[PDB]
Design an enzyme around this catalytic site. Structure first.
Site, mmCIF file in Angstrom:
data_model
loop_
_atom_site.group_PDB
_atom_site.id
_atom_site.type_symbol
_atom_site.label_atom_id
_atom_site.label_comp_id
_atom_site.label_asym_id
_atom_site.label_seq_id
_atom_site.Cartn_x
_atom_site.Cartn_y
_atom_site.Cartn_z
ATOM 1 N N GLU A 2 -3.538 1.490 -5.119
ATOM 2 C CA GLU A 2 -2.939 0.259 -5.583
ATOM 3 C C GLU A 2 -1.671 -0.026 -4.812
ATOM 4 O O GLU A 2 -0.740 0.772 -4.777
ATOM 5 C CB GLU A 2 -2.652 0.315 -7.086
ATOM 6 N N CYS A 3 -1.656 -1.166 -4.152
ATOM 7 C CA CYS A 3 -0.484 -1.541 -3.431
ATOM 8 C C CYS A 3 0.599 -1.792 -4.470
ATOM 9 O O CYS A 3 0.300 -2.179 -5.592
ATOM 10 C CB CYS A 3 -0.781 -2.779 -2.610
ATOM 11 N N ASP A 54 9.123 16.447 -5.281
ATOM 12 C CA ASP A 54 9.659 15.438 -4.391
ATOM 13 C C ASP A 54 9.921 14.131 -5.093
ATOM 14 O O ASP A 54 9.562 13.069 -4.613
ATOM 15 C CB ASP A 54 8.737 15.206 -3.205
ATOM 16 N N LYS A 93 -2.864 5.040 2.959
ATOM 17 C CA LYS A 93 -2.303 6.210 3.609
ATOM 18 C C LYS A 93 -3.397 6.806 4.488
ATOM 19 O O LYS A 93 -4.582 6.623 4.234
ATOM 20 C CB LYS A 93 -1.838 7.219 2.555
ATOM 21 N N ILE A 131 5.419 10.692 4.508
ATOM 22 C CA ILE A 131 5.080 11.934 5.266
ATOM 23 C C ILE A 131 4.207 11.817 6.533
ATOM 24 O O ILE A 131 4.747 11.742 7.638
ATOM 25 C CB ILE A 131 4.466 13.011 4.337
ATOM 26 N N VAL A 143 1.957 3.327 5.752
ATOM 27 C CA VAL A 143 1.121 2.842 4.688
ATOM 28 C C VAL A 143 0.813 1.389 4.980
ATOM 29 O O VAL A 143 1.668 0.529 4.824
ATOM 30 C CB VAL A 143 1.816 2.982 3.361
ATOM 31 N N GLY A 158 1.813 9.498 8.778
ATOM 32 C CA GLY A 158 1.474 8.104 9.044
ATOM 33 C C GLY A 158 2.190 7.064 8.191
ATOM 34 O O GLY A 158 3.066 7.367 7.354
ATOM 35 N N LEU A 214 3.795 -1.009 5.435
ATOM 36 C CA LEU A 214 4.579 -1.154 4.225
ATOM 37 C C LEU A 214 5.377 0.139 4.089
ATOM 38 O O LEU A 214 6.534 0.222 4.503
ATOM 39 C CB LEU A 214 3.672 -1.386 3.007
#
Ligand code: B98
Ligand code: B98
Ligand code: B98
Lengths: 282, 282, 282
Positions: free
Chosen positions: B95-96, B142, B49, B30, B34, B32, B26
């Site tokens: 939470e997606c 950020d 993550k 930064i 998700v 890896g 998804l």
């Protein structure tokens, strides 16, 4: 499709809840002894190292943990932080090994003698172990022949590598080369029955070193390079035929067993000399 | 009368016990990807993550944890330390969010256009999030428009702030001002469809900036002060009417949606320019 | 044959699950108050200190933990890390003590007066506590008479030592001597009703210091040596008869109780002067 292993877990409850602790000593490595210990639930025997529990150990083990996932590396099974003396301690519980220090098992072979092919297989294994570690940035820095032990006393039994009192993370002239050096040293003693001898020239006597193909004596060379550089990397080491042959090596008789019987007193010499050579070795 | 929330808890057992891990990616933040992930027990979808697990992350998350207790901040739900590659890793489960990057949802509104009042509400929220963090000494550093996503695709759906790869503890010219700057930048793009453009003058074109009350163009000013100082504090920012009005803002039509359709290619430009401007920005 | 105590364990779940938190304050030490608290399961009363939770505390307690295993040291019973304000906090739960600050219990004896033998017993105990700590490398550095409290209000009740806000690990002119000094100071006040008085000469008034064997006044000396050196070590301190006699000490009447009644206002003086003398004392 997606595979992980549980992280390291510092159990806090008294190890005495889960295991029944004997006092029968087994190993006598770096800090403390290695007591035999039994799992209340399953009831099998285990090894118990005990540590001061300071940042250092706590990481040393942190590595062993990562390492145990390997066959030829001794598996950690439980790690506890309890309070002994009055001292935040650190009990690491690992698969007991009833096999005896690699070499200590060769001089009770009794029947027949040893084999160039059997030597390979041994070295071969030892090679692997180091690989893994290196292959995850770990220098053992103490690959002595005491730190290799077999699981059981059956000749099917396998041996593993122990004592991470010395390992270090090769993170972010160098380091993980001792581990090679050692293998070299190890191979030598394995084939003949002795090492070098200074503080470098290593001769190859008649009654031992004979038609033993120069291909072999080559290895030992590349490994023993008193250099840190051009000491044949493990990756390299593994690739070299002799090793990855396992069974395509000459069946040559080896005097090593008998040799070891020849002066079992010239040994606690060797073993210290090995700790001498290493430990300090940068 | 007395209220606490559970502390952060680093589960050690294989995340694979508790969740079934897909491979459907998804997010691509930064470290890896998700991955989508499902809770065996409850069976709902989650974000995963994955981190190297070194002191740094371990604190970065340590903050996210503290942060999730907020509405407009994405909630962490589980944090595991397992061993992937051969690497003490760090899987954070949250939470997606099935909503798409704040802006990416505006250019598929299709029906009608956008509203000065709708812009407020958006900004308004984003404001809050920062507040909280600041109000607990946290600089996100950020606040890009990728790092804002909605929970679902319903227009009732809310959006939250993500990716703490950058946050830092404002503990014990300064710091948590970027977070403001961004809001400013964010508001701009929100109203028109573009940012500034150098490495500072920002003009206000006719076909966009019109009877748009100078009270609004004021904000954007105070926020964009190429200064670190006099960049309107968030506390300040919130107090200013427009924001805390939500519904008392003009209903003015906004071209932004259409504008965004106008050159969807002038965007992966914007988004990088945003990472450009920031990230390094002290 | 082999004995350990469980290590320290930082519970993460909300302390509110396991205990019902009151607001009734009791202690008012270093950080925060000490609230009364009840164990849902068992339903007994407990003390709750609350800490910022930073490296410092996290070790301070780490010691208390090791210390609680002692009788005369107050026992920690549970340690939680929850999130209060918005702050990774640290709730340590310990045996509530319903006894009052050592001295505060002597001036409500009412019936009769105090005893040279009763003074010993008190000092005697206090001695022990320090021993242990020292005997495991711990300097309390704050042995004030507020930090001593009794378990209950029965005269059988025992007293313990508290507040490790100050302790330090004597690891790897010196340190754990304050702890002695204090005892000295403590003994003085114990026998008479006052301390020294400068920023060193301590006189011994008639109406108090009388046929009180020079053997006793000796102790007080060795302890009070304005030196850090030749301040009688605890090991030493314990060996000296008076102490390890408990019951072989003269039964002499002591005015101390009455003395304390004599100016209960000259006290919040003493107690601060004690914190004055210490705390800074290197
Ligand atoms: C007998 O079963 C075991 C199992 C694990 C371990 S680890 C270890 C052992 C030892 C012995 N023995 C002492 C030395 C190696 N000689 N170093 C060590 O740390
Ligand atoms: C889709 O559901 C989620 C939920 C949480 C998170 S966190 C996160 C995500 C992301 C996506 N996506 C990648 C970037 C933001 N674009 N950074 C991040 O850390
Ligand atoms: C009443 O039951 C207790 C139990 C433990 C503790 S610890 C502690 C207390 C206190 C009181 N009180 C405040 C001061 C000592 N006066 N310092 C401390 O840390």
């Amino acid at each position: 499709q997606f595979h992980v292993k549980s992280g390291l877990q510092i159990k806090k409850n008294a190890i005495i809840d889960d295991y029944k602790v004997t006092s029968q000593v087994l190993g006598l490595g770096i800090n403390g002894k290695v007591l035999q210990i039994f799992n209340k639930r399953t009831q099998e025997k285990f090894a118990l190292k005990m540590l001061q529990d300071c940042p250092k150990a706590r990481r040393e083990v942190e590595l062993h943990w990562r390492a145990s996932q390997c066959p030829h590396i001794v598996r950690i099974v439980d790690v506890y932080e309890n309070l002994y003396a009055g001292r935040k301690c650190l009990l690491i519980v690992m698969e007991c090994l009833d096999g005896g220090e690699l070499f200590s098992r060769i001089q009770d072979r009794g029947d027949q003698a040893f084999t160039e092919r059997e030597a390979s297989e041994i070295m071969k294994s030892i090679g692997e172990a180091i690989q893994y570690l290196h292959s995850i940035n770990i220098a053992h820095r103490d690959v002595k022949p005491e730190n290799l032990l077999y699981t059981s006393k059956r000749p099917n039994a396998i041996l593993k590598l122990t004592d991470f009192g010395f390992a270090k993370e090769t993170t972010s002239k160098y380091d993980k080369s001792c581990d090679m050096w050692s293998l070299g040293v190890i191979m030598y003693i394995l084939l003949c029955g002795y090492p070098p001898f200074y503080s470098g020239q290593y001769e190859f006597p008649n009654p031992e070193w004979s038609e033993v193909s120069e291909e072999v004596k080559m290895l030992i060379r590349n490994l023993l390079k008193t250099e840190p550089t051009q000491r044949m990397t493990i990756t390299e080491f593994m690739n070299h035929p002799w090793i990855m042959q396992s069974t395509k090596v000459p069946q040559t008789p080896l005097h090593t067993s008998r040799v070891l019987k020849e002066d079992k007193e010239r040994w606690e010499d060797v073993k210290e000399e090995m700790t001498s050579a290493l430990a300090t070795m940068r």
